[PDB]
């Protein structure tokens, strides 16, 4: 797992963990503090971190729309402003076999405790949160449909696709 800070927001920490071979997504959903995000829609750390940035800008300088920072970040991944749509499309699904587990921490985070909590919730195998692993699980076709990308847009690589998604996130 990774623990990160956005430079202009020094006191807020965010933890991110990636799981594969997840067996109990249906159970997790039925028991839904964390955000549980569908990696099929996340191609890079750049994209994920741009949404964390947007979340904090929106909450500090505009208006929070949802319950907390974790839920606000799921909304900020989306290109559009309907909260239920964002939760459905970017949140895990009953059939999810991977997930991203995200939490905002508003002191230093107790990592051992955090790992224990996540493992008590998720039946699956944690792997490193990095671009090599995110590149395994994103679904470009689904991303194109959800972010409304034209077929004429043909990035040569993941960085190119990521840049379009960051744009959508920043301009939502």
């Amino acid at each position: 797992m990774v623990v990160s800070i956005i430079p202009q927001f020094p006191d807020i920490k965010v933890s991110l963990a990636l799981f594969e071979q997840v067996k109990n997504a249906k159970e997790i959903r039925s028991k839904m503090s964390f955000a549980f995000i569908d990696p099929r829609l996340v191609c890079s750390g750049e994209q994920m971190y741009s949404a964390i940035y947007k979340t904090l800008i929106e909450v500090k300088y505009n208006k929070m729309r949802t319950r907390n920072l974790n839920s606000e970040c799921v909304l900020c991944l989306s290109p559009t402003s309907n909260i239920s749509d964002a939760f459905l499309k970017f949140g895990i699904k009953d059939d999810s076999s991977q997930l991203i587990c995200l939490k905002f921490h508003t002191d230093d985070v107790d990592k051992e405790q955090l790992r224990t909590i996540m493992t008590s919730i998720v039946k699956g195998q944690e792997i490193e949160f990095n671009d090599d692993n995110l590149s395994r699980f994103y679904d470009e076709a689904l991303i194109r449909k959800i972010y409304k990308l034209s077929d004429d847009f043909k990035p040569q690589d993941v960085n190119g696709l990521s840049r379009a998604l960051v744009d959508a996130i920043q301009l939502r």
Partner: protein
């Protein structure tokens, strides 16, 4: 006071160096606005602060999606406080000839411009403008300072910056005025070679339109005609 307010907004964790102030203030920073330290991919970035930010950000994002158009990456936007973070484009020219915008590149080569490098680079500048206009966008402030050359081995790749006055537009009048502003900016150096530079740029512009078959040919005639009218109305009569 601007420096106080920006550094307070960013906090002391973000280094800043001012590089330009107009009637927006522009900084560089080595700090990425959201990727963890050392997980980013570039030495430095641009912060553009307006004490409009939305218009420019929206245009940069739309243009990126158009095949062939070269614009800086929109990294982050805070429209509530007037900040845009951008990819840093260009570099210092060797021999103290300055930042690699088109203006400085032309000055550097002005004593001996008849080379494959210069002609090819200027044709590529025209191609960028051609793509912009073909797709019904307008730059609004198309000077030789808003065209930035990015090094690609022994070649240069022209990019467009500063879309503060940009717009979506299918008006040929807008297109002619964009072309005229660049033509005049290039002429304003009084260089003996300025007419040739503009000729090479127009070659690149025309190539883009002619690549679009009969439809492109008709649209090009429209634009070039209006451009001629703008030139006529541009000086005392």
């Amino acid at each position: 006071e601007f420096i106080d307010k920006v550094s307070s907004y960013l906090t002391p964790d973000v280094d800043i160096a001012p590089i330009s102030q107009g009637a927006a203030i522009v900084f560089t920073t080595t700090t990425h606005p959201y990727l963890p330290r050392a997980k980013d991919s570039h030495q430095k970035y641009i912060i553009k602060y307006r004490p409009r930010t939305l218009n420019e950000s929206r245009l940069l994002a739309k243009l990126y999606l158009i095949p062939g158009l070269c614009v800086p990456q929109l990294i982050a936007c805070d429209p509530y406080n007037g900040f845009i973070w951008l990819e840093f484009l260009g570099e210092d020219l060797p021999g103290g000839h300055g930042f690699s915008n088109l203006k400085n590149f032309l000055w550097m080569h002005d004593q001996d411009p008849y080379s494959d490098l210069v002609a090819t680079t200027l044709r590529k500048v025209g191609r960028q403008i051609g793509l912009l206009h073909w797709n019904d966008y307008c730059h609004g402030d198309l000077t030789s300072s808003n065209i930035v050359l990015v090094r690609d081995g022994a070649r240069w790749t022209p990019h467009l910056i500063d879309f503060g006055l940009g717009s979506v537009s299918n008006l040929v009048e807008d297109k002619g005025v964009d072309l005229y502003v660049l033509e005049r900016a290039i002429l304003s150096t009084h260089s003996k070679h300025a007419e040739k530079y503009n000729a090479w740029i127009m070659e690149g512009f025309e190539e883009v339109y002619r690549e679009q078959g009969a439809k492109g040919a008709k649209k090009l005639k429209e634009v070039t005609k209006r451009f001629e009218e703008v030139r006529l109305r541009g000086r005392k009569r």
